[PDB]
Amino acid sequence: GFSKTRENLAVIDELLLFWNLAETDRVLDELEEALLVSDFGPKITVRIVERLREDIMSGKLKSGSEIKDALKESVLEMLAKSKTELQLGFRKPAVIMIVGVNGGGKTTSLGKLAHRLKNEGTKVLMAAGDTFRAAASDQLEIWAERTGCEIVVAEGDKAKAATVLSKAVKRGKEEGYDVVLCDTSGRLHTNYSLMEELIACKKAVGKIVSGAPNEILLVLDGNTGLNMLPQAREFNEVVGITGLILTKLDGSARGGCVVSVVEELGIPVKFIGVGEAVEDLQPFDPEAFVNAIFS
Ligand SMILES: Nc1nc2c(ncn2[C@@H]2O[C@H](COP(=O)(O)OP(=O)(O)O)[C@@H](OP(=O)(O)OP(=O)(O)O)[C@H]2O)c(=O)[nH]1
Ligand SMILES: [Mg+2]
């Protein structure tokens, strides 16, 4: 879990061992390099390091360990200015939409999240709202069966996503479900009016339970997340994103990208994907994360 990042950032500890006032510029240049090699973006590394330099000059930081602590809390302040928990409220069912470009991990993140909720006694219905392919619903159907979830699939091939999602949330209300988890399409052709279809899913579920969707989670591959930020912002601006799922961070040496996307999007990360097994979805805790990568 970011163990590669922790190993790379550990050179900051060795550096700070021998810091003194005179060695400040050397230490920071080389702190900056360690943050940059991890995926801390240029804009925030400069702010972190310039904040450290201001606080060393004004005497607020007088030892290697104080500098290390201030680094950690400067990063924490950029992660957590925002709640990272799912807020499902009390009206039933709660509705969670998983959105994002195909390839990124929506369907697998959905099933892993369903497995967590079922471990918690939550009764979960899955909605196969990616109607592009038959194989998308069959893939989701595989997840519904090894997690104990019933699943609502489309009736015909030309079915709208909103149609399936509305049927599914209607069904979830009636059968006594706590949560309906909605898979959606992420067609990268995007001459497909993806945004439009997502807005129609949003309205369709809101007419069945006012307040739904309680969460719209944007799935972003953690390795290529810094690239598609324009696409992320479009999801957030047009649909409205309540949280991020950063996937494929298995043993990431790129832990800074978490900080960077959060800083740049202003959307909390709620879960990290760290592998392909059903349990490889971990809730995101900013303090635990900052401890994870800086020990
Ligand atoms: N290592 C790692 N891999 C992840 C993670 N999340 C998703 N993957 C993988 O990315 C691929 C795409 O996931 P999907 O869930 O189908 O993506 P999508 O719905 O957004 O289109 C899957 O593997 P696939 O090869 O495309 O298909 P399959 O493995 O399910 O057969 C899935 O296993 C993660 O956190 N860590
Ligand atoms: Mg999918």
Question: What is this structure, in a nutshell?
Answer:
This protein is of the alpha/beta class and 295 residues long.
Detailed description of the structure:
There is one protein chain. The chain is of the alpha/beta class. It has two domains: 3-79, SRP54, nucleotide-binding domain (Four Helix Bundle (Hemerythrin (Met), subunit A), Up-down Bundle); 94-294, Rossmann fold. Helices cover 48% and strands 14% of the residues. It is built from twelve helices and eight strands. It has helices at 3-9, 11-17, 24-37, 42-57, 64-79, 106-118, 134-145, 161-174, 194-206, 229-238, 256-265, 286-294; strands at 94-99, 124-129, 150-152, 179-184, 215-221, 243-247, 269-273, 281-283. An eight-stranded mixed sheet has the order 3-2-4-1-5-6-7-8, with helices on both faces. Helix 2 runs antiparallel to helix 5. The longest helix has 16 residues, at 42-57. The chain is elongated and about 70 Å long. Bound molecules: guanosine-5',3'-tetraphosphate and magnesium ion. Guanosine-5',3'-tetraphosphate is lined by residues 100, 102-108, 186, 219, 247-248, 250, 273-276, 280. Monomer. Interacts with FFC/cpSRP54, a component of the cpSRP complex, composed of a FFC/cpSRP54 monomer and a CAO/cpSRP43 dimer. The complex with FFC/cpSRP54 is formed when both proteins are bound with GTP. Its main location: plastid. GO terms for molecular function: ATP hydrolysis activity; GTP binding; metal ion binding.
